[PDB]
Amino acid sequence: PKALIVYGSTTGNTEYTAETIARELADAGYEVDSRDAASVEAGGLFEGFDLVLLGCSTWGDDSIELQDDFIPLFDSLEETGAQGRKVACFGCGESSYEYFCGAVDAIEEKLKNLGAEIVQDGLRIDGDPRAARDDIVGWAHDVRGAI
Numbered sequence: 001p002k003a004l005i006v007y008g009s010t011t012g013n014t015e016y017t018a019e020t021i022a023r024e025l026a027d028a029g030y031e032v033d034s035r036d037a038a039s040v041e042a043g044g045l046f047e048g049f050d051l052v053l054l055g056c057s058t059w060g061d062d063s064i065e066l067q068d069d070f071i072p073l074f075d076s077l078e079e080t081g082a083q084g085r086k087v088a089c090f091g092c093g094e095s096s097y098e099y100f101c102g103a104v105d106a107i108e109e110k111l112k113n114l115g116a117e118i119v120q121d122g123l124r125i126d127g128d129p130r131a132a133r134d135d136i137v138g139w140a141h142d143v144r145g146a147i
């Protein structure tokens with residue numbers, strides 16, 4: 001199968017998470033395309049992929065804002081080919097904020113509304129992802145066994 005992983009990441013934590021997932025899928029025999037959100041165009045982005053994984057960190061002062069490179073993709077998610085696509089979401093944040101990984105909820109909700117098939121509940125990482133590597137790999141295992 002072919003998997004696409006798209007991530008928005010400003011300090012590297014969601015990027016590190018995306019690459020650890022990519023390695024686990026690649027070792028399972030997938031062909032994986034891992035792209036930063038800053039370099040992609042929404043139109044038709046998911047065409048051809050068996051599985052799409054979207055990851056983003058959460059920002060904003062008092063509100064929920066998505067990571068800046070991911071905003072344009074989020075705003076044009078209806079042109080990506082998400083209807084009927086198997087997807088799953090992930091993201092890093094910090095539990096001291098009101099909306100812990102609130103970008104993950106906003107993306108899952110928009111996908112569900114477009115008719116995507118959410119394969120597993122979102123992976124939500126608190127603090128340093130390097131200290132939660134076991135959770136990331138476990139989650140990557142679960143999504144692969146699901147689709």
Ligand SMILES: Cc1cc2nc3c(=O)[nH]c(=O)nc-3n(C[C@H](O)[C@H](O)[C@H](O)COP(=O)(O)O)c2cc1C
Pocket residue numbers: 008009010011012013014015056057058059060061063064065067092093094095097098099100101102127
């Ligand atoms: C100003 C600011 C607002 C933040 N807002 C949230 C938030 O609303 N919820 C959350 O879970 N984390 C929030 N964070 C934490 C970042 O998401 C966290 O540092 C994360 O690891 C960044 O991941 P990234 O390196 O992939 O961009 C915020 C951090 C800053 C500095």
